Amino acid sequence: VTDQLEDLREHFKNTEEGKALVHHYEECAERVKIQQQQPGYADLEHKEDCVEEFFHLQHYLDTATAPRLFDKLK
Amino acid sequence: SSLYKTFFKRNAVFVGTIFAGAFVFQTVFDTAITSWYENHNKGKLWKDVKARIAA
């Protein structure tokens, strides 16, 4: 018996909206990776992160999974 | 309403009766509420769970 919540998050990462949101987060993750490899990163004090893109994804998942999860639990 | 007249006949209800009625109402009302409340929550109460846990 696998975790009901991680099970719901997987299903919803697979919808059109889900796939789109992880894509947007993914593009950011890549853009960030390339910035970290470049020389001089350590001293920029205005570095980009992907919390925002991650939050949009997580918010979508939460909105879909929240009302369904408890039906899958005792 | 004749339903009222047969009991009080054009007079207003007196204190004694009001108080007496309040006492009857408390008992009856409490039972009815607890009864409805417990039934609406069948399976969740401890007494219901205690019955389940038998081993």
Add this chain to the structure above:
Amino acid sequence: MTAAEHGLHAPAYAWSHNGPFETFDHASIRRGYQVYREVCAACHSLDRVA
């Protein structure tokens, strides 16, 4: 305030105790104690509970 600082908003799950007429699920309370004893107690106290 930035999203990170705010912290992600917690979604609304269907707690069986959400609602004017709902009691707690006592079987869930009993199961919860076990999780507290076996997983949390080692780091967290429950000082006001006798």
Add this chain to the structure above:
Amino acid sequence: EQAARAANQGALPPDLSLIVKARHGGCDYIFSLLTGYPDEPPAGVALPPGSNYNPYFPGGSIAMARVLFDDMVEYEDGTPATTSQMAKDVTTFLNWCAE
């Protein structure tokens, strides 16, 4: 308090008797926190040595690491002890402690 912080890298695990009422979000927050630890923080976020990332925690950086994992407990009534099931159960128990 001193012994507590020593066993937790300077951090102090709060008493949970009122945790459900002591935080905006109540049960939803507790549950989301317990089941909201990703495998890794988002790209670009540098995590303080000794910290753990959790989006639901203000700041994102929390001293408590994820502790709930599938079947680390064996429920007496035969209920499948999944992380979310356990999260749901303790949160319910913690709500009773508080109210």
Add this chain to the structure above:
Amino acid sequence: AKESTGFKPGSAKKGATLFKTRCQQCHTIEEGGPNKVGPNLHGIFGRHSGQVKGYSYTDANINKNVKWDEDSMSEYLTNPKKYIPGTKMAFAGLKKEKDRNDLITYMTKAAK
């Protein structure tokens, strides 16, 4: 000890993240790794229980006097406080047989 155990090799990668998520918070397993909430685990599979220098141990851990081998580590990781009553190690245990096998595999490698 034997006759109640059953360690078998497994995945070192699966155990590498299993250590990362459920063990490295309090432990460091590299040679030259400092002590934290818990003692450094490098070379642990050789020595006896409660011997890492510079770490304040529990009397129950020192008094356990066990030569840490795969089988003992497995029985320990299943339920720490059952194996060592009184240990200050906060961890319920790796209840699934393959989980501890995969973890111990990675451990044995990074240990030596």
